[PDB]
Amino acid sequence: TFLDTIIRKFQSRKFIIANARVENCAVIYCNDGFCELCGYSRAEVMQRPCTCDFLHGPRTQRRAAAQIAQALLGAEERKVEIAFYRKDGSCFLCLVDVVPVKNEDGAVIMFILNFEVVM
C-alpha cells in the first residue's frame, strides 16, 4: 500500500486519487474535504471516473471537460477551471489541478486531482 504514502499528501485540501491502470481512471480515494466540498459522501464518490462527470450540470463547459480528459491522457500537471455542481444543486467555479503520479520507468500509474473554489 504505497497509496497511503501518496495519501500522506492530505490545510482544507480537497482531492481525489485515481487509478490510471484501469480504462476510466476510477477514483480509489477521496479525502473528507472533497466529499464536504461537493456534498457527496465517500461511498457516493468512490469508483467513479475521476473526471467527476457526476458534478456536471448546465454551466459545465464541454471544452473545460475536454481539457481535463486530455490531461488524463498526458503526463504533465494541468490546471483547468470548470463549473461544478454539489449534490444540493448549487454551482461552484472550480480550479482543478491534475497531477500525474509515475513509476520508476516514468509511466503514469495514478493521478491526484485537487479542487479549489474560484471567485
Author numbering: 13 to 22, 25 to 133
Pull verbatim passages from the article behind this deposition:
The KCNH family of voltage gated potassium channels includes the EAG (ether-a-go-go) channels, the ERG (eag related gene) channels and the ELK (eag like K+) channels; these channels have roles in cardiac repolarization, neuronal excitability, cell differentiation and tumor growth. A defining characteristic of KCNH channels is their large N- and C-terminal cytoplasmic regions. As already stated, the role of PAS domains in KCNH channels is unknown; it is not known if these domains bind small ligands or mediate interactions between the channel and other proteins.
While the body of the domain in the Δ9-hERG PAS is identical to the full-length PAS structure, with a main-chain atom rmsd of 0.74 Å (residues 26–135), the N-terminus adopts a new conformation, with residues 13 to 22 forming a helix that packs against the hydrophobic patch on the domain. A consequence of the packing of the helix against the domain is that it prevents the participation of the hydrophobic patch in crystal lattice contacts. Some of the amino acid side-chains in this N-terminal helix are not well defined in the electron-density; similarly, two residues (E23 and G24) in the linker connecting the helix to the first β-strand of the domain are not defined and it is therefore not possible to determine if the N-terminal helix packs against its own domain or is swapped with a neighbor in the crystal lattice. Interestingly, a superposition of the dELK structure with the Δ9-hERG PAS domain through residues in their β-sheet reveals that the N-terminal helices occupy the same relative positions at the center of the hydrophobic patch of each domain. Our crystal structures of the dELK and Δ9-hERG PAS domains and the previously reported NMR structures of the hERG PAS domain have clearly established that a stretch of the N-terminus in KCNH channels forms an amphipathic α-helix. Interestingly, the crystal structures show a conformation, with the helix packed against the hydrophobic patch on the β-sheet, which is different from the one in the NMR structures. In the LOV-HTH DNA binding protein the N-terminal helix packs on the β-sheet, side-by-side with the C-terminal DNA binding domain, and in the LOV2 domain of the blue light sensor phototropin 1 a small N-terminal helical extension packs against the sheet together with a long C-terminal helix. It is therefore conceivable that in some functional state of the full-length channel the N-terminal helix of PAS adopts the conformation seen in the structures of dELK and Δ9-hERG PAS.
